[PDB]
Design an enzyme around this catalytic site. Structure first.
Site, mmCIF file in Angstrom:
data_model
loop_
_atom_site.group_PDB
_atom_site.id
_atom_site.type_symbol
_atom_site.label_atom_id
_atom_site.label_comp_id
_atom_site.label_asym_id
_atom_site.label_seq_id
_atom_site.Cartn_x
_atom_site.Cartn_y
_atom_site.Cartn_z
ATOM 1 N N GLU A 11 47.996 -35.152 -41.599
ATOM 2 C CA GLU A 11 46.657 -35.200 -41.045
ATOM 3 C C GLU A 11 45.773 -34.091 -41.584
ATOM 4 O OE1 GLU A 11 45.658 -37.597 -39.032
ATOM 5 O OE2 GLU A 11 47.539 -38.504 -38.332
ATOM 6 N N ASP A 20 36.936 -39.732 -40.502
ATOM 7 C CA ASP A 20 38.120 -40.174 -41.223
ATOM 8 C C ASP A 20 37.728 -41.275 -42.222
ATOM 9 O OD1 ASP A 20 37.737 -42.753 -39.948
ATOM 10 O OD2 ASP A 20 39.421 -42.342 -38.555
ATOM 11 N N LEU A 32 41.428 -37.516 -32.503
ATOM 12 C CA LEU A 32 40.338 -38.477 -32.496
ATOM 13 C C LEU A 32 39.360 -38.129 -31.423
ATOM 14 C CD1 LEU A 32 39.044 -41.158 -33.586
ATOM 15 C CD2 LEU A 32 40.440 -42.366 -31.892
ATOM 16 N N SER A 117 58.113 -56.079 -37.779
ATOM 17 C CA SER A 117 58.717 -54.857 -38.222
ATOM 18 C C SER A 117 59.580 -54.213 -37.126
ATOM 19 C CB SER A 117 57.675 -53.876 -38.685
ATOM 20 O OG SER A 117 56.768 -54.573 -39.474
ATOM 21 N N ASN A 132 57.899 -55.669 -44.278
ATOM 22 C CA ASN A 132 56.973 -56.148 -43.272
ATOM 23 C C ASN A 132 55.975 -55.071 -42.846
ATOM 24 O OD1 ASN A 132 59.265 -58.077 -41.251
ATOM 25 N ND2 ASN A 132 57.722 -58.751 -42.725
#
Length: 162
Positions: A11, A20, A32, A117, A132
């Site tokens: 990050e 972002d 966020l 997945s 996947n």
């Protein structure tokens, strides 16, 4: 290596509100702030979070505090999510990190949406899962990050972070 190191690498660290690649507002180590397209709202959330008028610029200490809280929340969310928990619990330490990384980036819900997945990871079908996991929006949004995380699920080692 651990989850905290892994995320810091992925990050980054920035002290002033930034956008972002998707256009959303964040700060620190990927915290966020809002998806609303208004810097004022982002500042408002920040002040709320931080507890003071920060004018959109926090310190490194403040950044770390948020970072810890965020990772904690991610774990907690996995642990109370009916669909995330069993998978998580089936995993080794390295692969648990990779799952928390996804949750941190997308939220409990977003991750709970990789139905296929998730099923494969649970069955230890690493290669299958890896394929996947790549057929997703996620992968097109942040391909280098996604590759790293994918390889970690694939290999169960931290090679991708070296």
């Amino acid at each position: 290596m651990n989850i905290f190191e892994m995320l810091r690498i992925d990050e980054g660290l920035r002290l002033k509100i930034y956008k972002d690649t998707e256009g959303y507002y964040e700060i620190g180590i990927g915290h966020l702030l809002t998806k609303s397209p208004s810097l004022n709202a982002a500042k408002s959330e920040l002040d709320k979070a931080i507890g003071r008028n920060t004018n959109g610029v926090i310190t490194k200490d403040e950044a770390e505090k948020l970072f810890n809280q965020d990772v904690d929340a991610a774990v907690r969310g996995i642990l109370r999510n009916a669909k995330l928990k069993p998978v998580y619990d089936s995993l080794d330490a390295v692969r648990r990190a990779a799952l928390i990384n996804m949750v941190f980036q997308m939220g409990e819900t977003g991750v709970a949406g990789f139905t296929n997945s998730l099923r494969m990871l649970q069955q230890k079908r690493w290669d299958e899962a890896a394929v996947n996991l790549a057929k997703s929006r996620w992968y097109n949004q942040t391909p280098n990050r996604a590759k790293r995380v994918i390889t970690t699920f694939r290999t169960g080692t931290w090679d991708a972070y070296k």
